[PDB]
Amino acid sequence: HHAIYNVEVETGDREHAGTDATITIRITGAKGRTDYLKLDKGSFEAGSKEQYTVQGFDVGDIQLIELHSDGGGYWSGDPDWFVNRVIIISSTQDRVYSFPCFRWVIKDMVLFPGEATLPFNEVPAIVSEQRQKELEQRKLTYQWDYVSDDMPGNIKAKTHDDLPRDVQFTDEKSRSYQESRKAALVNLGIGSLFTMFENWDSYDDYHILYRNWILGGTPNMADRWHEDRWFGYQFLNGANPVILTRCDALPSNFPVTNEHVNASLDRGKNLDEEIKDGHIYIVDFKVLVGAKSYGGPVLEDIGYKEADIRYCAAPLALFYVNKLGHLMPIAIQINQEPGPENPIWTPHEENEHDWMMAKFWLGVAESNFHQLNTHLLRTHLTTESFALSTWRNLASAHPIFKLLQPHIYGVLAIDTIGRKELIGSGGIVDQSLSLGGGGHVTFMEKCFKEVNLQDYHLPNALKKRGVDDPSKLPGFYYRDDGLALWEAIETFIGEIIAIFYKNDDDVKRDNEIQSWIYDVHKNGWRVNPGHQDHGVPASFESREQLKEVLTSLVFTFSCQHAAVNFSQKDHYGFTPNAPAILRHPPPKKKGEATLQSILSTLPSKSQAAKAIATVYILTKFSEDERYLGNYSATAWEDKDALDAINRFQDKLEDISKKIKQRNENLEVPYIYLLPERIPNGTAI
Kindly list the residues in this chain that would bind Fe ion in the complex (CB under 5 A). Answer: 565
Phi, psi (rounded to 5 degrees) for 100: -70, 145
The amino acid that residue 668 corresponds to is V
Q: Which does 35 bind (CB under 5 to 8 A by kind): Ca ion, Cl ion, Fe ion, none?
A: Cl ion
The reply on whether position 470 binds Ca ion by CB under 5 A is no
CB of 628 to Cl ion, least distance (A): 20
Q: Which is nearer to Ca ion, 40 or 308 (CB)?
A: 40
- The CA–CA distances, whole Å, from 395 to 102, 249, 413, 635 equal 13, 51, 21, 12
Q: Which is nearer to Fe ion, 335 or 565 (CB)?
A: 565
Count Cβ atoms below 10 Å from residue 79 Cβ, excluding itself.
20
- The CA–CA distances, whole Å, from 443 to 376, 440, 595 equal 11, 5, 31
Q: Which is nearer to Fe ion, 382 or 565 (CB)?
A: 565
Q: Which does 116 bind (CB under 5 to 8 A by kind): Cl ion, Fe ion, Ca ion, none?
A: Cl ion
The amino acid that residue 659 corresponds to is I
The SS3 call for residue 7 is strand
Closest CA to 138 of 95, 167, 99: 167
Residue 112: which region, alpha, beta or left (left: phi > 0; alpha: psi -120 to 50)? beta
Closest CA to 48 of 81, 13, 78, 22: 13
Q: Which does 565 bind (CB under 5 to 8 A by kind): Fe ion, Cl ion, Ca ion, none?
A: Fe ion
The SS3 call for residue 376 is helix
Q: Which is nearer to Cl ion, 28 or 176 (CB)?
A: 28
Instruction: Choose, by CB under 5 A, the member of 10, 66, 78, 469 that binds Ca ion.
Output: 78
The reply on whether position 115 binds Cl ion by CB under 5 A is yes
Q: Which is nearer to Fe ion, 453 or 562 (CB)?
A: 562
The reply on whether position 205 binds Cl ion by CB under 5 A is no
CB of 641 to Cl ion, least distance (A): 5
Restricted to residues 405-464, the positions that interact with Ca ion (CB under 5 A) are none
Closest CA to 507 of 399, 634, 395: 399
Instruction: Choose, by CB under 5 A, the member of 4, 30, 40, 42 that binds Ca ion.
Output: 42
Q: Which does 34 bind (CB under 5 to 8 A by kind): Fe ion, Ca ion, Cl ion, none?
A: Cl ion
Q: Which is nearer to Cl ion, 28 or 567 (CB)?
A: 28
Which runs of consecutive H residues, i.e. helices, occur in 110-163? 125-141
The amino acid that residue 410 corresponds to is G
Q: Which is nearer to Ca ion, 15 or 676 (CB)?
A: 15
Q: Which is nearer to Cl ion, 399 or 524 (CB)?
A: 399
> 290, exposed or middle or buried, with CB in 10 Å at 0-12, 13-18, 19+?
middle
Size of the site for Ca ion (CB under 5 A): 7
Instruction: Choose, by CB under 5 A, the member of 4, 32, 35, 70 that binds Cl ion.
Output: 35
- The CA–CA distances, whole Å, from 625 to 110, 176, 414, 509 equal 28, 10, 14, 36
Q: Which does 571 bind (CB under 5 to 8 A by kind): Ca ion, Cl ion, Fe ion, none?
A: none
The reply on whether position 71 binds Ca ion by CB under 5 A is no
The SS3 call for residue 139 is helix
CB of 635 to Cl ion, least distance (A): 7
In the bound state, the residue with its beta carbon closest to Ca ion is 42
Q: Which does 42 bind (CB under 5 to 8 A by kind): Ca ion, Fe ion, Cl ion, none?
A: Ca ion
Instruction: Choose, by CB under 5 A, the member of 34, 379, 565, 601 that binds Cl ion.
Output: 34
Instruction: Choose, by CB under 5 A, the member of 116, 127, 362, 429 that binds Cl ion.
Output: 116
Spatial contact of 68 and 79, defined as CB atoms under 8 Å apart: no
The reply on whether position 56 binds Cl ion by CB under 5 A is yes
Q: Which is nearer to Fe ion, 558 or 565 (CB)?
A: 565
d(CA 95, CA 640) in angstroms, rounded, equals: 19
Q: Any residues with CB less than 8 A from the CB of 75 and at least 6 apart, and which?
A: none
The reply on whether position 637 binds Ca ion by CB under 5 A is no
Restricted to residues 434-493, the positions that interact with Cl ion (CB under 5 A) are none
Contacts with Cl ion, 57-96, as mask; x by CB under 5 A: x---------------------------------------
Instruction: Choose, by CB under 5 A, the member of 8, 10, 50, 171 that binds Ca ion.
Output: 50
CA atoms within 13 A on the CB side of 122: 0
For the residues of 367-405, what is the DSSP string, one character each? HHHIIIIIIIIIIIIHHHHHHHHHHHHS-TTSHHHHHHH
Handedness of CA 76, 82, 87, 90 (dihedral sign): positive
Q: Which is nearer to Ca ion, 86 or 612 (CB)?
A: 86
Spatial contact of 422 and 371, defined as CB atoms under 8 Å apart: no
Q: Which is nearer to Ca ion, 78 or 469 (CB)?
A: 78
Restricted to residues 598-657, the positions that interact with Cl ion (CB under 5 A) are 636-638
Q: Any residues with CB less than 8 A from the CB of 680 and at least 6 apart, and which?
A: 406, 407, 409, 557, 558, 626, 627, 628, 629, 630
CB of 78 to Ca ion, least distance (A): 4
d(CA 523, CA 533) in angstroms, rounded, equals: 14
CA atoms within 13 A on the CB side of 523: 20
Restricted to residues 12-31, the positions that interact with Ca ion (CB under 5 A) are 16, 19
Binding site for Ca ion (CB under 5 A): 16, 19, 42, 50, 78, 80, 646
Binding site for Cl ion (CB under 5 A): 34-35, 56-57, 115-116, 636-638
